[PDB]
Design a protein around this ligand. Structure first.
Ligand SMILES: [Mn+2]
Ligand SMILES: [Mn+2]
Ligand SMILES: [Mn+2]
Ligand SMILES: [Mn+2]
Ligand SMILES: [Mn+2]
Ligand SMILES: [Mn+2]
Ligand SMILES: [Mn+2]
Ligand SMILES: [Mn+2]
Ligand SMILES: [Mn+2]
Ligand SMILES: [Mn+2]
Ligand SMILES: [Mn+2]
Ligand SMILES: [Mn+2]
Lengths: 190, 190, 190, 190, 190, 190
């Protein structure tokens, strides 16, 4: 009923998205950026979507292009699956405690495209989360949320109230967005 | 079941209110202050009330008296329709993103009459929203919320977290109050 | 006994005042500036005067000239009605609470002409109170009180202790002056 | 003529009030909070009311609930005894010197419910007045005045100009309110 | 009924006071300090007392001793004339505008002896008011009020809200005290 | 289904807890610290738990040990009743307006044990709430929330946005925690 398949071929990347709004958290993500995969899996699971993401891009340069193209495509998919947006709650919000971190997200699904991102500590502008593969630079977080909001055509406010660890700060934000979205897309019985 | 009709004749104004708490957003407002009508329509619609407001007053002087008398009457109507307040959720809260603005409202329907209004930028104390008719001075916003809280006998906290445009700041507040109220008045299944 | 009729024809305006100090609050004011009419009605009523004011002036330019000429004429009328000022209380003072606002006025009816106006918030220097007709600029408040004091030949101190809303701040001042005057003009039984 | 009897049974407390506005200072107060009794006796005496207060409540927890319920009931009684408020002075004010302390109160009996409480030193937010029984926390002072104003439906401004001793600061305020009220409720011969 | 005659012989001075509280402003003062005479005449007149003061002292040294002894004696006279203080208003207050100056006094006639003097500009600590005879140093003002309060056994608060001219500041204070006293000593019809 | 009985014998105290998560607000608390009883009753009622608490301890020393042991035991009971935490909402949050106070709590029931307590005014570090029995020191509030979070093994964030009265600040926090918990423990229909 509320599904979408989006294919996006750029020079930098090739993306396929499959999205079902009324899912059970069946998620499979593979972008070539493992930390981003972890974040998108959290997003899909906590939003209770069914989500498949397959992306290959120029990760030799860095993750930026792949991360950005995926967020654009995912936003487009969300917009298409939403459709006319009839009989939904429309507004949603969620607080996410994650150890010392507290994050908040609020959404308006019918409101004009807009993104406000506040409260993130200054060291996240140059922090890197690195494992055995392509690293993730936390400066991209804002870029991801802006891209989603612009392509889904929604109002999205994301706040970090406080926090220290960049893994916790980042993960809390992705989960807050997911749970705000989940509440907003649900049918309203009025 | 939860209805009220209030008539209020003062020297300044004459008001009739009809309110149904368990409505479908059937709203008709005419006060002679078009921007106030827009705000009250948002209130009634987003609260899912059925609301009819008819007001005539001394708008040649300014909107103040009409705006204030209407808010007093509407508060009285809300109080009467609430009744004994049995088996309701009682507490309600809502975040409203509106472009760059974010507003929040929290209510306690059984709590003693109280109003706290914080966060509004300083230029709203002397801003005017003007069209082709009677203008609206945003300094009145606090007055409207205080009057409602006092006459409905409820605790009402309204916060502006941030924002720039006075139309957005004002509208976000009215909508936040509406959605907080909607949540609070709903039957609690416990 | 204590009555006065004053006619004042300038290039800007034409004014007629009728004043009885020992009245019952029978007041009729028409200046072409509705908010000023509201303020002068409050003045006459709360002072327990009988007061008729009829003024036409160059309101196409703005209210300034009409407001100023009326205040000058009203001051002259007050002075004439007071006469020799024999056996009156002479000193009067009053506090006026008006919602969040508190204003104070003190008068000496035999004291030399003087006016001190303090405590008014800075935004009142450029605030406008506007309805469906000629607006009122709150910067004129000081001008009105100075003009009255100068032409009645009295000492008049007006203070705003605190306040927010310009309608409340302005109305509180007019009422404070009225009640200070009422106390001062009353016969002293000593 | 201007009398009221109010009974108020809550879970926390049980209150009976008997109030005559046109009394001779015949006062009998018993709440189980001796310092509060002293304050209410001062109130009734200095206002020239006849006042009987009988209250029992959960003083094992603390005085808060009993003090608050009594103030609510007393406000209700004042409102009822006032009635239509015809031919009264309406405005009243009083300065109370008490050793080093100076307090002031101003009232408008027909003005909309409002309370402003300013000037109290910061140490009164955590000061206790303790004898051989249930103590009194001076932080409650504001709560008492707000409750009275809200339930009597009057404008009440209470200011402490300066002072040091908490017994003097508290007692001065109660007496200032009493004498402001006394002036306001008196018949106006105009 | 309320009269007193006080004789006070010190090494510095010899004083005779005759005071009637229920007078018509029949005042005759001669201390050898002309400006002080002017001030005491204002006091007696505005309080509506009948007052005779005759004082000779060591004015070759300066006015201090004469001014102080007279104030002590006058306080004693006021105390004696007051008597048991039965059926009086007890509390009194007055605002005195004098050109640019505004002064205030509040009294409690049954309250314990106390004097608070605030608001006087700093240049009054070394200002002199000089004519053709013995000059008056405005630093003495506080001393005069303290002495009166201590010997009459009353609470007396004197405030200067603002002002510039030392003659106006001083005279306003003496008149404020007089009118506060007048109100307080009057019979209370309750 | 979701019940727990916990017995805890220390040297300082002896505690018995009985907890049902799926209750109707049937609460009975007796610790020997009346204000704490009031707070725990609010907790149990607003969380819609069925809760029996029986505690005796060394209250002659002070409440600390009894308050702490009870919170530890209650946390343990909550943890046991939660069990595997299958099919619950997991996240919960609530705003509580209480007169001038606004408090907020957010919980993650599966998140690692953590407690963050922010926003409480500084005077609560040395404020006492005292009645006719064992008093309550508000400095303990943080200790209570930390103990609960540690023994239930949950993430608990408690914030005071603003407030003045210590009774209101404290009660608002306990109620916020209760309503956050209520939301989190409820079955999730997804
Ligand atoms: Mn980019
Ligand atoms: Mn992780
Ligand atoms: Mn108003
Ligand atoms: Mn709009
Ligand atoms: Mn001019
Ligand atoms: Mn008005
Ligand atoms: Mn309370
Ligand atoms: Mn005492
Ligand atoms: Mn000396
Ligand atoms: Mn002079
Ligand atoms: Mn401990
Ligand atoms: Mn309580």
């Amino acid at each position: 009923s509320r599904r979408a398949r989006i294919e996006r071929r750029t020079r930098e990347s090739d993306i396929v998205i499959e999205l079902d709004l009324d899912g059970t958290g069946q998620v499979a993500v593979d972008t070539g950026v493992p930390f981003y995969d972890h974040m998108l899996t959290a997003l899909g699971s906590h939003a209770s979507f069914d989500l498949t993401v397959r992306a290959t891009g120029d990760v030799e340069i860095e993750a930026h292009h792949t991360i950005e193209d995926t967020a654009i495509a995912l936003g487009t998919a969300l917009g298409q699956a939403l459709g006319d947006k009839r009989g939904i709650r429309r507004f949603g919000d969620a607080f996410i405690p994650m150890d010392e971190t507290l994050a908040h997200a609020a959404v308006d699904l019918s409101g004009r495209p807009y993104c406000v991102h506040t409260g993130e500590p200054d060291h996240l502008q140059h922090t890197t989360i690195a494992g055995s593969s392509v690293p993730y630079h936390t400066v991209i977080n804002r870029h991801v949320f802006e891209s989603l909001a612009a392509n889904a055509r929604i109002a999205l406010h994301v706040r970090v109230l406080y926090g220290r660890d960049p893994h916790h700060i980042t993960e809390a934000q992705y989960k807050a967005v997911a749970r705000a979205l989940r509440q907003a897309v649900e049918p309203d019985p009025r």
